[PDB]
Design a binder for these strands. Structure first.
Ligand code: MG
Ligand code: MG
Ligand code: MG
Ligand code: MG
Ligand code: MG
Ligand code: MG
Ligand code: MG
Ligand code: MG
Ligand code: MG
Ligand code: MG
Ligand code: MG
Ligand code: MG
Ligand code: MG
Lengths: 70, 61, 142, 103, 69, 199, 138
RNA sequence: UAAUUGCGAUAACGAACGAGACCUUAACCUGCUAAAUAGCCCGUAUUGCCUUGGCAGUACGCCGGCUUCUUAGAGGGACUAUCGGCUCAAGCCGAUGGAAGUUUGAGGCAAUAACAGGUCUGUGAUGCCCUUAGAUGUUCUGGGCCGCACGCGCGCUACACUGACAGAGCCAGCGAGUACUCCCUUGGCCGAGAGGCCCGGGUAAUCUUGUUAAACUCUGUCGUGCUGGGGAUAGAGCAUUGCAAUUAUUGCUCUUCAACGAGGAAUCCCUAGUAAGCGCAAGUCAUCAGCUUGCGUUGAUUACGUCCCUGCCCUUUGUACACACC
């Protein structure tokens, strides 16, 4: 169960472009992603939402290299 | 024969030419100080209890 | 309370109905007994001597539960596997004459009648109430 | 003007094209104040053919399974005879239609 | 190996003085020590059943077992 | 009313088998518990379980189920579990009349006694065997005990006037004590003897 | 009006639809009572939802069940599932669920499969089930 | 990590195929849109039994009500989410919840470079060579491809009591079907049996069809004897298909009653509704399945690993090999 570059690369750009609009909740982040992105698969959308909510959990305690937002 | 009872505390890899044998660290469950190394043929979990016919053989490595 | 066919065990009910027809003692027999195979798949005649009478009791029992039945349907209901030798077995149906005449003779006993409106044979007004009466012979026999 | 209780049957291989035909057809009759009965869902009939891949018989033995699916979605209505002619016009490719007065 | 299909006085007496001590009586037991055929064993099984000397534990189309009274 | 009068006798008391209760279990040894499961009673053994998905999931399963499944083998008896349940029930009645103890009382002691405690492992020696006489885990001990008991009954009843109903029954009472004339005991002592030599 | 609820249980290919109607404590399947519809040894697997719960909790309930499809032992597993689902669904709608939650917790603690189905079907393959044909010289 | 899948280190930076994504299918929805070619409740008429007020069936309703079960559309649903323990990170192990937690299960498609792989007997795809009116063209009669001291491979039926035989009980799923001539076939009568005759339904969720299949379950007979286990071999008779049945096309009745007691050296397949057991449908088809492609019923033992054998992928290293350890 390892996420490929398409999932990881797309998660990086979403966080920095729209940081405050989406939060630690997985359910809310699911509805944030499909409005501000063009995804052709429901399963692909689910995986993207799963990774981005994981990234902010560790963001809450100290910043992480490779991530920059305003 | 003075048969002894031992209990498993840790599992240490799988040995043997074909992986059939497994190596475990046992506990004598009557004198808690002593501890040795043995080999077992079947599936083993932690806190399992084994019966030893002789308690002086030990095992390689 | 009242009981019916569904309220009694099938094995003892058909055996009980075989006993009643002994006392009534009126069922036509066309001389086929002791010679027929009762089916192409088989090799030996039935062991029990009064097999013509036990079969009729069971045949009338399921028609009580089914809306329309003919000789063709009963031919394959009583069929079974056949030992073709060293080849794999299959399914073949029972004899036609045995099942046809066991219910043709059952017509004149006033148990079930024809259904020319759509086909097959159905149970009659007084025919069904007769098999209901023998149910109490078994239920309170307990 | 005598009602005849018509019934219309449809057949096609596509699934999306057929569905929107019924969606507009039911609306074409509903706005005209006609009592319409629902679009029943007949079973899909799938038929398949299996054949060996190789044309000579050499090598390993491998087969493939072709497929084909058909849907019906038949519809019926209560209306006079002449009015129904103008209600089934302007149909697209793929869907086949059969008319039955069912008098 | 072969057993006896007929029951004589030499075998009849064996039943009524020994079955009072058996814990189980089955088709196999009669063929084992009484040296009698299985068909006779079943025949011997049912006739003594109504005589009131053994009681049925379980009845089945495959095996039957009886014990003391 | 809705239930037969037979089952009304047991409904008042604690739940149990057709005839026998799982109370008063043996106090004889250790290291064999946690792998024979009797804490959850079952009316009939038959059950469509999920015991073949993980490693030790089948350890939590009634022993009668374990015994019943192993009874049907050798081609003809595949999937015929209904026949197996009948054999076990009838065999349990046979042992009850020859011994006042519970039929499960006999069955449990039969398993715990016919399990080998040492075995020789195959380590290559370029055509020779360096049998090291390794120990045996508790899970394998109960698994191999079941196989020995069932294959003995299957061997005896083959081409014999006896039926498997009591051939299985007579082994369990034999295996309850050190009878040494049973198939399981003959093989168990033989396996332990060869292991001692290769020490 | 009359109090009734419909539940169903499934197996591989055995569907058992049931309707529980406020009655007097009568249970019959396919018309016949519980005395008949099962193999003799398999009749035990029908009574468990009663003994674990008690006959006193079936005081005024009537159940009629129709089942078709599948096999002999598959069908008996479906009907025993409908009995458990019927009693818990009727209790939720018409009486306090303090029984229902106590009914549900106790029923699944003995066996979880009584209320939930097991998903199992077959796999098609081009060699048989899962094994291939014999090889000549490997 | 299932993966050149990622975390990262970096004389490299940025990209293109393959993997993944994706498509079909199997599991969930008492929520939406619905349905007499799919059902239920209800209401009439009507039957039996207790009689109660009941219980079990029948026939009808076409705007009486409804969609749990059946059916196919639009969408929802799993992401490893939450919790605990390792780690800087990517990730891994266990538990709870849940229809579902191996990539959820099983498939389809599938890169660069190659082989003197197979096919001229699939093709009115094709070069060259050959014969072309005593034809290698085409067509009609007859025969052969099946001929049997012997060796080898893919299968079928068995060596029985966990069985055979006799009566009764009684449960599936995927599919197929009528022409310029009858294709699946209900019902009725005759017939030991296989079959025969007369009305009739269905171009098909409408009729055959609930395809009430087999194993299996209950009650009996036989009793360890190659015997009622086993059905090879062979005689006679009665039938169907076709223009034609001998070297028997196949089917039915009576009689004949072989070898074969769990199989040597060797050797193949397989991890959950899976192995094995058993049957059904389709393909070829006037008739003939012991074969193949699919479907359901019953339903386990054992591992959750290692590189010892037979092989595969990456790196360091040696070479007198390059047709490359044959
Ligand atoms: Mg076979
Ligand atoms: Mg296949
Ligand atoms: Mg299979
Ligand atoms: Mg095969
Ligand atoms: Mg996949
Ligand atoms: Mg040839
Ligand atoms: Mg006509
Ligand atoms: Mg119909
Ligand atoms: Mg013979
Ligand atoms: Mg065919
Ligand atoms: Mg062929
Ligand atoms: Mg060198
Ligand atoms: Mg070099």
């Amino acid at each position: 169960r390892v996420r490929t570059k398409t999932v990881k690369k797309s998660a990086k750009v979403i966080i920095e472009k729209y940081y405050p609009r989406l939060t630690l909740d997985f359910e809310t982040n699911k509805r944030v992603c499909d409005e501000i992105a063009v995804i052709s698969s429901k399963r692909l959308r689910n995986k993207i939402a799963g990774y981005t909510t994981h990234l902010m959990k560790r963001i809450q305690r100290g910043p992480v290299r490779g991530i920059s937002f305003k | 024969a003075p048969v002894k009872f031992v209990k498993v505390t840790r599992v240490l890899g799988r040995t043997g030419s074909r992986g059939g044998v497994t190596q475990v660290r046992v506990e004598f469950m009557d004198d808690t100080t002593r501890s040795i190394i043995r080999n077992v043929k079947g599936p083993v979990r932690e806190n399992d209890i084994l019966v030893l016919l002789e308690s002086e053989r030990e095992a390689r490595r | 309370g009242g009981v019916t066919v569904r309220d009694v065990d099938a094995h003892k009910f058909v055996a009980a109905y075989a006993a009643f027809l002994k006392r009534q003692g009126k069922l036509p027999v066309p001389g086929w007994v002791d010679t027929v195979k009762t089916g192409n798949a088989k090799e030996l005649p039935p062991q029990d001597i009064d097999w013509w009478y036990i079969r009729a009791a069971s045949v009338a029992r399921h028609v009580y539960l089914r809306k329309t039945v003919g000789v063709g349907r009963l031919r394959k209901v009583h069929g079974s596997a056949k030992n073709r030798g060293t080849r794999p077995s299959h399914h073949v149906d029972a004899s036609g004459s045995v099942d046809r005449k066991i219910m043709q003779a059952l017509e004149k006993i006033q148990v079930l009648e024809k259904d020319e409106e759509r086909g097959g044979r159905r149970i009659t007004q007084q025919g069904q109430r007769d098999l209901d009466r023998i149910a109490q012979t078994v239920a309170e026999a307990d | 003007p005598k009602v005849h209780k018509i019934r219309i049957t449809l057949t096609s291989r596509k699934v999306q094209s057929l569905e929107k035909v019924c969606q507009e057809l039911i609306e074409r009759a509903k706005n005209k104040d006609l009592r319409v009965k629902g679009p029943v869902r007949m079973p899909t009939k799938t038929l398949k053919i299996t054949t060996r891949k190789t044309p000579c018989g050499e090598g390993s033995k491998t087969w493939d399974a072709y497929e084909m699916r058909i849907h019906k979605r038949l519809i019926d209505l209560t209306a006079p005879t002449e009015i129904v002619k103008q209600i089934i016009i302007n149909i697209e490719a793929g869907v086949e239609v059969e008319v039955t007065i069912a008098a | 190996a072969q057993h006896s299909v007929i029951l004589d006085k030499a075998t009849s007496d064996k039943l009524y003085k020994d079955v009072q001590s058996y814990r189980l009586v089955t088709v196999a037991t009669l063929v084992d020590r009484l040296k009698i055929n299985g068909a006779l064993a079943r025949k011997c099984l049912k006739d003594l059943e109504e005589k009131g000397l053994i009681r049925q534990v379980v009845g089945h189309s495959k095996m039957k077992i009886y014990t003391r009274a | 009313d809705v239930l037969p009068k037979e089952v009304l006798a047991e409904v008042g008391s604690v739940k149990l088998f057709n005839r026998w209760s799982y109370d008063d279990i043996e106090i004889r040894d250790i290291s064999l518990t946690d792998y024979i499961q009797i804490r959850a009673p079952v009316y009939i053994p038959h059950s469509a379980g999920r015991y073949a998905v993980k490693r030790f999931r089948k350890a939590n399963c009634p022993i009668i189920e374990r015994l019943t499944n192993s009874l049907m083998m050798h081609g003809r008896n595949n999937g015929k579990k209904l026949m197996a349940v009948r054999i076990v029930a009838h065999a349990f009645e046979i042992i009850h009349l020859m011994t006042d103890q519970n039929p499960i009382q006999v069955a449990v002691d039969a398993i715990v006694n016919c399990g080998p405690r040492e075995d020789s492992t195959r380590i290559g020696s370029a055509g020779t065997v360096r049998r090291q006489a390794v120990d045996v885990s508790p899970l394998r001990r109960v698994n191999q005990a079941i196989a020995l008991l069932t294959t003995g009954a299957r061997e005896a009843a083959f081409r014999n006037v006896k039926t498997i109903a009591e051939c299985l029954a007579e082994e369990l009472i034999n295996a309850a004590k050190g009878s040494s004339n049973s198939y399981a005991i003959k093989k168990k002592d033989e396996l332990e003897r060869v292991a001692k030599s290769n020490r | 009006s009359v109090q009734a609820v419909q539940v169903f249980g499934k197996k591989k290919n055995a569907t058992a639809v049931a309707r529980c109607v406020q009655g007097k404590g009568l249970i019959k399947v396919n018309g016949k009572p519980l005395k008949l519809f099962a193999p003799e040894i398999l009749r035990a697997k029908l009574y468990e939802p009663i003994l674990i719960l008690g006959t006193d909790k079936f005081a005024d309930v009537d159940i009629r069940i129709r089942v078709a499809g599948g096999g002999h032992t598959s069908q008996v597993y479906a009907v025993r599932q409908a009995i458990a689902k019927s009693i818990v669904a009727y209790y939720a709608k018409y009486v306090d669920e303090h029984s229902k939650n106590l009914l549900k917790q106790e029923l699944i603690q003995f066996d979880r499969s009584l209320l939930v189905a097991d998903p199992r079907r077959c796999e098609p393959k081009k060699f048989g089930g899962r094994g291939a044909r014999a090889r000549f010289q490997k």
